[PDB]
Write a protein that binds this DNA or RNA. Structure first.
Ligand code: AMP
Ligand code: MG
Ligand code: MG
Ligand code: MG
Ligand code: MG
Ligand code: MG
Length: 642
DNA sequence: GCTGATGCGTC
DNA sequence: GTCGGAC
DNA sequence: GTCCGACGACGCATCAGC
């Protein structure tokens, strides 16, 4: 009702009508969304964030139902269903230019402040706009802002960037209080609330459970939990939370779910939104494990299967009744246009009795001349959009490992033993085109160790381990990481570790604001007696170790780089460091780099070598730079991968 | 018509 | 993708 | 164990700038 500036969606006994900061039927103000973001950001307990978001959503349901979908998208920082491919195309560069123009400041001055503060939002809000007149424009609304975000994402073609900057400036001109901070963070793709998809779903089921949609105004039922004991309320909300969560994992599309929720309610939701081919679903993921002993501990006495973990890209393959075929990525992006070859071979992989299906597969680059798997880096050279089958140069072999839907039957609640059997009996293998994941059903620790050894020898990353009957379903809402990934480089003493020289540091963003978030590392090239940048590094250290690194490196800061340090195309560090510290670094593999100079010319004329999945292990106090891993040793390690 | 910077995607 | 922090 | 956001290499698609 009153000024949204005082809106407190975190207040005790929050009343969806009386504590709202707008009137019935009015559009939700964006400042209401922003104050909710502030109250979420101030706390660290997710459950407190969920209650706060729930309070906002209850007011939205009660007062302004049409703004529910935009508010949810704003809270996720999404533009729409992932398979529709809406993208801002903005990024820090465009955003920082728009902030500069809106405030009249120099781009470079804005850039330096952002790096220092580790946050663009604070730079955007703390500086006023030259564009603004004496009179402010009307206040921003949640749906107004969301549609402008969509406008940005739809702009294409020549001069589209200028048009994007104009929209962004228009937004900043109208911002009040904390609004610009979250507009800017949203545009840069770093909203960083500490609340995301799972907490948004929890807030949404709680909200529509406590404040049902569809009530004649004023709503007779503002809080449907008030008549319940605390224990009964909790059980009820957990039950309703799982209805929404399991539906969303089968149909992760708020454009479909929300209209149903507002019309028919949450209890009827599964009868209106169900898994079907053509709608991407959430995939089953995996937890790491440190060794075979641990696998047996997590699965106890449950029979399990081991499978090769292939190194390609996940492909969720849908065949609709009537013949249409769709392919989606692990993240529900539409990849149908990328695999014309796969689409044309569907008739060859399925027996003629199969009328529809959803397969879970790995797409792996395959050398038809040598009949062998190719590295991930080869796979990534495929074109991605509007590919014509004749133009394909990198062939793919599909390694199928699960089946989620068959002939109109959803298999989500079926044990893997049965899903696998339907997969094996209704689909046809062809060497180099479509094959079942190589597997072993055993409890013998010795066979597992060999089978692991062999998976590496056969061009794979290690093993995936899955129970067959006990907790062996495909219900992502019950456990999204139900499988176990046993990679060689997880083992504490088998992976390849390098001793690398710290040559630069990058100021941290977000959670790393105010310290270093990343470092530039180098190997030692003994031929030229120079240090060659090899990779950046930003994970593996605890917060405590990261504080010690800032302490021990601050004395090594230099105004200018050393002439025997070569970084070529790498990101220039915010702070150059006198080469001295040597860290032990682990990786999964070495890759051919278009930018890093380390070992350039030893394996390839144009490309140096970098690290795949690098992480800090520990400081090497017993090593000086001249004894770090050499560039020749790096080349030798790369060749060793064959 | 070409190239480079870069946003977004894959991992 | 890996990793650590807060719960 | 869950959920989240720090941070990694790298390649296609796109568009500003030539
Ligand atoms: O490393 P990670 O957590 O992303 O691993 C999960 C991914 O591994 C791929 N993959 C390859 N082979 C398999 C099998 N046999 N089973 C399950 N997943 C597999 C997937 O692409 C998955 O996303
Ligand atoms: Mg997307
Ligand atoms: Mg775009
Ligand atoms: Mg930076
Ligand atoms: Mg993989
Ligand atoms: Mg560590």
């Amino acid at each position: 009702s009153n000024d949204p500036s005082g809106y407190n969606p975190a207040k005790n006994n929050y009343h969806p009508v009386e504590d709202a900061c707008w009137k019935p039927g009015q559009k939700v103000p964006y400042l209401a969304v922003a104050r909710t973001f502030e109250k979420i950001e101030e706390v660290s307990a997710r459950l407190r964030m969920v209650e706060t978001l729930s309070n906002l959503l209850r007011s939205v349901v009660a007062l302004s139902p049409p703004d529910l979908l935009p508010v949810l998208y704003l809270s996720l920082n999404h533009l729409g269903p992932p398979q529709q491919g809406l993208e801002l195309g903005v990024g820090d560069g465009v955003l920082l230019k728009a902030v500069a123009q809106a405030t009249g400041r120099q781009l470079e001055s804005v850039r330096a402040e952002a790096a220092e503060k580790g946050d663009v939002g604070l730079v955007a809000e703390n500086s006023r706009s030259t564009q603004r007149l004496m009179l402010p424009p009307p206040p921003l609304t949640a749906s107004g802002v969301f549609s402008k975000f969509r406008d940005i994402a739809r702009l294409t073609g020549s001069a589209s960037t200028a048009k994007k900057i104009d929209i962004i400036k228009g937004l900043f001109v109208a911002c009040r209080h904390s609004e610009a901070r979250f507009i800017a963070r949203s545009l840069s793709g770093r909203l960083r609330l500490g609340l995301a998809e799972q907490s948004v779903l929890a807030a949404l089921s709680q909200a529509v459970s406590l404040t049902p949609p569809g009530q004649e105004f004023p709503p007779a039922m503002v809080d449907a939990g008030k008549g319940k004991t605390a224990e009964a309320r909790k059980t009820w909300l957990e039950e309703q939370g799982m209805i929404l969560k399991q539906t969303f994992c089968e149909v992760p599309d708020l454009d479909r779910i929300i209209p149903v929720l507002l019309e028919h309610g949450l209890e009827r939701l599964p009868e209106h939104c169900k898994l079907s081919p053509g709608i991407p679903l959430k995939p089953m993921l995996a937890h790491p494990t440190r060794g075979i002993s641990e696998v047996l501990k997590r699965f106890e006495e449950a029979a399990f299967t081991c499978e090769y973990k292939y190194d390609g890209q996940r492909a969720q393959i849908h065949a609709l009744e009537g013949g249409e075929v769709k392919i989606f990525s692990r993240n529900q992006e539409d990849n149908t246009g990328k695999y014309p070859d796969i689409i044309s071979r569907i008739p060859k992989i399925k027996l003629p009795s199969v009328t529809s299906f959803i397969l879970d597969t790995e797409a792996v680059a395959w050398d038809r001349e040598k009949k062998q798997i190719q590295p991930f880096q080869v796979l990534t050279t495929r074109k991605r959009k509007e590919v014509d089958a004749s133009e394909i140069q990198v062939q793919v072999c599909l390694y199928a490992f699960d089946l989620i839907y068959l002939n109109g039957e959803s298999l989500v609640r079926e044990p893997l033993s049965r899903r696998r059997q339907l997969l094996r009996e209704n689909f046809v293998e062809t060497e180099g085109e479509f094959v079942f994941a190589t597997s072993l059903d055993t409890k013998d620790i010795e066979q597992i160790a060999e089978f692991l050894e062999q998976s590496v020898k056969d061009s794979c990353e290690g093993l995936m381990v899955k129970t067959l009957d006990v907790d062996a379903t495909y219900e992502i809402a019950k456990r999204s990481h139900n499988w176990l990934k046993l990679k060689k480089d997880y083992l504490d003493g088998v992976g390849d570790t390098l001793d690398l020289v710290v040559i630069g540091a990058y100021l941290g963003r977000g959670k790393r604001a105010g310290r270093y978030g990343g470092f530039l590392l180098a190997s030692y090239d003994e031929d030229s007696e120079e240090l060659q940048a090899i990779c950046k590094l930003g994970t593996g250290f605890s917060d405590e170790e990261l504080e010690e690194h800032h302490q021990s490196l601050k004395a090594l800061v230099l105004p200018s780089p050393r002439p025997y340090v070569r970084i070529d195309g790498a990101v220039i560090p915010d702070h150059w460091l006198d080469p001295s510290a040597v860290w032990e670094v682990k990786c999964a593999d070495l890759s051919l780099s278009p930018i890093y100079p380390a070992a350039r010319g030893l394996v390839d004329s144009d490309k140096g070598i970098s690290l795949r999945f690098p992480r800090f292990i520990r400081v090497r106090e017993d090593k000086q730079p001249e004894q770090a891993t050499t560039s020749a040793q790096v080349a030798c390690l790369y060749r060793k991968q064959s």
